Amino acid sequence: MRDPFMEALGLKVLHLAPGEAVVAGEVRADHLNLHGTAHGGFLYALADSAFALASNTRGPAVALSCRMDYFRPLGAGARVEARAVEVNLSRRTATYRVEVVSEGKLVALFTGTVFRL
Amino acid sequence: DPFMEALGLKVLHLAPGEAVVAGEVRADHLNLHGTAHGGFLYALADSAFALASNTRGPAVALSCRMDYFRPLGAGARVEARAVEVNLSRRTATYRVEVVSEGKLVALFTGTVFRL
Amino acid sequence: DPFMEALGLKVLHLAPGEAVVAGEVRADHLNLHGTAHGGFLYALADSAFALASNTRGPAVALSCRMDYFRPLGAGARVEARAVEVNLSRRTATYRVEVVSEGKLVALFTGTVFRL
Amino acid sequence: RDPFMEALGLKVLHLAPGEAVVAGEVRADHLNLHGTAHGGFLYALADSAFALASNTRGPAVALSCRMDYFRPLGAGARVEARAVEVNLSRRTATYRVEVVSEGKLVALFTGTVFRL
Ligand SMILES: CC(C)(COP(=O)(O)OP(=O)(O)OC[C@H]1O[C@@H](n2cnc3c(N)ncnc32)[C@H](O)[C@@H]1OP(=O)(O)O)[C@@H](O)C(=O)NCCC(=O)NCCS
Ligand SMILES: CC(C)(COP(=O)(O)OP(=O)(O)OC[C@H]1O[C@@H](n2cnc3c(N)ncnc32)[C@H](O)[C@@H]1OP(=O)(O)O)[C@@H](O)C(=O)NCCC(=O)NCCS
Ligand SMILES: [Cl-]
Secondary structure (H helix, E strand, O other): OOOOOHHHOOEEEEEOOOOOOEEEOOOOHHOOOOOEOOOHHHHHHHHHHHHHHHHHOOOOOEEEEEHHHHHHOOOOOOEEEEEEEEEOOOOOOOEEEEEEEEEEEEEEEEEEEEOOO | OOHHHHOHHHOEEEOOOEEEEEEEEOOOHEEEOEEEEEEHHHHHHHHHHHHHOOOOOEEEEEEEEEEEOOOOOOOOEEEEEEEEEEOOOOEEEEEEEEEOOOOEEEEEEEEEOOO | OOHHHOOEEEEEEEEOOOOEEEEEHHHHHOOOOOOEEHHHHHHHHHHHHHHHHHHHOEEEEEEEEEEEOOOOOOOOOEEEEEEEEOOOOOOEEEEEEEEEEOEEEEEEEEEEEEE | OOHHHHOOOOOOEEOOOOOEEEEEEOOOHHHOOOOOHHHHHHHHHHHHHHHHHHHHOEEEEEEEEEEOOOOOOOOOOEEEEEEEEEEEEHHHEEEEEEEOOOOOEEEEEEEEEOOO
């Protein structure tokens, strides 16, 4: 299933399986904030995308509540990967942990819950 | 801001501890469902959050939360309104309401570390 | 509510989509540092959250966030004021401000699934 | 010693650098009006492991915490929370706290502290 925003940000789906997904991307010049580092919205979009894909392997679902914890700043050129794993699957909701990693370092931690339509 | 420009976001208001940013959901901002991508709405809220916090001095985001209430389609005009909830020497927290045509689309809560 | 009674919490106000719960930090509500335990302040906010959301019918908490701004000592009078920020057919979200002697001690944000 | 932890009957099973395990049992005084463990009790348990694990690195105070609830628990249920360090910076640290009962994840807690 094509995701226009993911493609606009240059994010690619690497792997998809029941309740899990791995999305990859690279911080580009157009993803930076005024300080020369990756904008918080880009790293979130990346993690949120892995989250969207992993959650929808279970059926139609939409983002309900998500948390993003930032640990390390990134500059242009940095290769990034977001790996989503299912921590809970219920009939009406599901929760996923998404780790954002760059060169073996945990850049950010995303926690999200979807509402299963 | 490169990312803001790429997403077509515009700063409408900036004052001590507050900021308002606006944008429009374009075809390239939709997700796999054909609705406004959660990452786009977050980027909008995060932008106002960043601007508002920076009026107090340099700061880095630590933890942010986004709660989604209503979906939006292409063409929807959206706005993020950031207000300061707490300001301390080393941290600050802001509430950012994402609204479209009088409806609360999403609620963002973010905390920064003040440098 | 057994836990509210155990913590000595009192309901000061209850209306559709809102509630105010009050309590005092006792000696058995402190953490290892001698200040109000984060779990006590959360329990207070969570209780107002639970009461406010149940005014709309049966519901179960899904996700809650607690942001701490100021510490409190034994004897502090505290209040959790919950207000509905969003209501849908199957969900509801509340903002709960935890205050003591005119200061915003913490901010709670929670969402429930409406049964 | 933590007064609130003791009031709730919580016990420290293990404490090590950046880690902690706290256990307890849901008692009659921990229930909500619906007869299940109050959300404040489960959070208090997670928060306690979080506080202990974080303070092994030096004095620290909670900034922001998230609690996701998955399964309700009744009185008598044995529960434990394990706090693991996910990130350690000079000024802050973040921990993942899994709340479990009989091998099942009852809730997930995520917390960040400010290191004094
Ligand atoms: C989570 C969610 C599905 C829960 O909704 P619900 O309780 O099951 O059902 P409701 O019918 O009460 O819908 C709630 C609101 O969303 C709207 N909505 C829901 N589905 C819609 C759709 N397919 N098209 C247009 N509007 C829709 C409702 O009209 C209502 O807005 P309103 O109060 O202004 O009328 C809903 O809050 C929602 O859509 N949240 C946004 C999710 C989102 O866009 N996430 C990011 C992208 S994945
Ligand atoms: C994280 C925190 C320390 C950052 O503070 P800061 O920006 O570096 O500095 P500030 O001078 O602006 O903060 C002053 C407040 O913190 C207090 N404080 C500072 N050092 C303290 C300490 N060692 N022990 C107890 N309180 C302390 C002040 O007394 C004042 O609190 P008050 O208004 O209730 O009297 C602050 O936001 C805070 O105290 N948060 C509360 C965390 C909390 O209580 N969490 C739950 C229990 S662990
Ligand atoms: Cl959160």
